[PDB]
């Protein structure tokens, strides 16, 4: 027995005798920022800039989860064009985070040409965000009624470009890992996550369905209008770091089916709810309306006031079940904000995953659970 101390930003205490693994006990907290308590001291409008800072990869998911929940509370109705723009944005954030998980996979497998490509794809996706939202990460775009402003004339013709090169591109990656040269021998038997156990440790992020459990929130508790899209939930055989890798890739494919499907119904109209009690008034009349001037001043200073009550709406990110648990006391600022971080609960299945297995494999056995520290730690 020889207890060694590892340390991405994740300190791992590995009790070990020989070359196996007797138990891993992770110590997290090195990225603890304290979102949950800082948000009790901000506007509901001001909390929107805190959501994208946790999962900085698939950040739009947090933006969405938090918004969807506030909307519920204060009976706000999202226009058709905003529901469409939000799903187009959501999966676009999703492919951006899968591309990152994939890319760090193409590096363990030595393929440097297929990697330098994945890095350019993600850059074209980030390019797209900066087009509409002026930021590459943390785009302060989703709002409680819909979205900040409409999108620029250059967003659609750019999305199409990346909507013509992706379809096949995706398949190339599916092949490189499926028609596995090395990969087969590095993954096929490692990270044994039994179906009955995942559903006990609460693992969720496709690392769940790569284990044979057919549970995706967009289908079982449908939210932002996904109720009306075409959807295959990629499934895996017996949960390993092989099945897990391919699933994510098989997901990227279904995310493009959405992006295209949604792009089809995108129609001109309003982009956020006209209710003066939830939205500031059109700026153009700020030169005329007493009421408008009054509402504006008051909107951006003291916040709006949701009713007393508690609400939890479940969403699905690239990493599993997401969701905000908001408790309101009728203030400018929420009374409690508990964030159900997927990556956090997905980590309890790590001490079981690499149980008694090799040790150089333990790097890739962690990377197959797609954790983001900001998510776990928060």
């Amino acid at each position: 027995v020889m207890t060694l101390n590892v340390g991405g930003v994740l300190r791992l205490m590995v009790t070990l005798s020989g070359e196996e693994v007797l138990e891993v006990v992770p110590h997290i907290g090195y990225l603890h920022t304290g979102f949950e308590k800082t948000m009790e001291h901000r506007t509901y409008l001001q909390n929107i800039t805190y959501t994208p800072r946790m999962d900085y990869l698939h950040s739009f998911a947090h933006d969405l989860a938090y918004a969807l929940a506030v909307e519920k509370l204060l009976g706000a109705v999202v226009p058709p064009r905003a529901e469409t723009i939000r799903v187009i944005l959501n999966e676009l954030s999703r492919l951006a985070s899968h591309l990152v998980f994939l890319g760090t996979g193409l590096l363990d497998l030595g393929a440097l040409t297929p990697f330098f490509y994945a890095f350019r794809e993600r850059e074209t996706i980030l390019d797209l965000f900066e087009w509409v939202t002026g930021q590459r990460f943390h785009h302060n775009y989703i709002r409680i009624g819909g979205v900040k402003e409409d999108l620029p004339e250059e967003f659609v013709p750019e999305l199409k470009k990346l909507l013509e090169v992706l379809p096949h591109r995706i398949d190339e990656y599916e092949a490189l890992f499926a028609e596995s040269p090395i990969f087969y021998e590095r993954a096929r038997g490692v990270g044994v996550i039994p179906p009955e156990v995942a559903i006990d440790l609460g693992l969720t992020g496709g690392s769940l369905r790569a284990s044979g459990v057919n549970y995706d929130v967009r289908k079982a508790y449908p939210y932002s209008g996904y109720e009306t899209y075409t959807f295959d939930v990629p499934l895996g055989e017996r949960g390993d770091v092989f099945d897990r890798m391919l699933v994510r890739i098989r997901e990227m494919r279904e995310s493009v089916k959405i992006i295209k499907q949604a792009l089809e119904r995108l129609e001109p109209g309003p982009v956020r709810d006209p209710n003066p009690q939830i939205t500031p008034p059109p700026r153009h009349l700020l030169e005329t309306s007493m009421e408008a001037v009054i509402y504006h001043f008051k909107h951006y200073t003291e916040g709006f006031h949701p009713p007393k009550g508690e609400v939890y709406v479940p969403t699905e990110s690239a990493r599993g079940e997401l969701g905000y648990y908001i408790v309101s006391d009728g203030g400018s600022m929420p009374y409690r904000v508990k964030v159900r971080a997927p990556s956090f609960v997905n980590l309890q299945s790590l001490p079981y995953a690499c149980k008694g297995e090799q040790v150089p494999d333990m790097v890739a056995i962690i990377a197959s659970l797609d954790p983001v520290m900001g998510d776990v730690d928060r």
Binding site: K308, G330, Y335, R340
Partner: protein, 196 residues
């Protein structure tokens, strides 16, 4: 489906069903009957334990049963055995002067880390958890940060000429138990909700 058999039971035996119009519903079990009846739920077919949230109501405008409370979330994954997809929350209030509450680590494995966090950030003990050790806050943090009476600890933001700002004294935003800048508040400033 599997939740009907839950409500048809709680109704019968003095369990309060809490219901917002939005799509969630609670059931508040007393202290003692929690441990056992909570196991009753697993057998009933509740396999997944999605979350577990700690709530401190100290600074809440209306009074509540006891100072603290923990909420659990139970589910039946719709991609397994027969599982219907029943979901809900179960809450229990917990004395301030006695922060103890039995663990469900017997029943769900996810409840491990989750229970630890509720203990780090609020002072709530869990009778029989593998190891109640701090999860998120640094090792030498004195006390439990997520509760109301523990300061956020803010630094004044600084500018030139000794012009500084204290975020606490600055926020135009109100705290619900907060009276406001004028005499009183009323109407939409005590809560607003549209009628879809």
């Amino acid at each position: 489906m599997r939740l009907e058999r839950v409500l048809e039971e709680a109704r019968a035996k003095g369990y309060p069903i809490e219901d917002n119009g939005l799509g969630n519903l609670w059931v508040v079990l007393p202290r003692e009957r929690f441990k056992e009846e909570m196991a009753h739920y697993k057998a009933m077919g509740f396999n997944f334990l999605a979350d577990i949230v700690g709530l401190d109501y100290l600074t809440y405008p209306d009074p509540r049963p006891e100072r603290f409370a923990v909420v659990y979330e139970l589910v039946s994954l719709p991609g397994w055995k027969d599982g219907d997809g029943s979901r809900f929350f179960v809450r229990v209030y917990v004395p301030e002067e006695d922060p103890r509450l039995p663990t469900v680590t017997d029943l769900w494995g996810s409840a491990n880390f989750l229970e630890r966090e509720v203990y780090d950030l609020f002072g709530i003990v869990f009778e029989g958890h593998p190891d109640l050790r701090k999860i998120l806050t640094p090792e030498d943090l004195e006390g439990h940060p997520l509760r109301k009476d523990y300061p956020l600890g803010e630094t004044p933001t600084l500018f030139r000429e000794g012009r500084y700002i204290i975020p606490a004294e600055f926020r135009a935003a109100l705290t619900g138990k907060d009276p406001g800048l004028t005499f009183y508040k009323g109407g939409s400033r005590k809560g607003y909700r549209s009628l879809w």
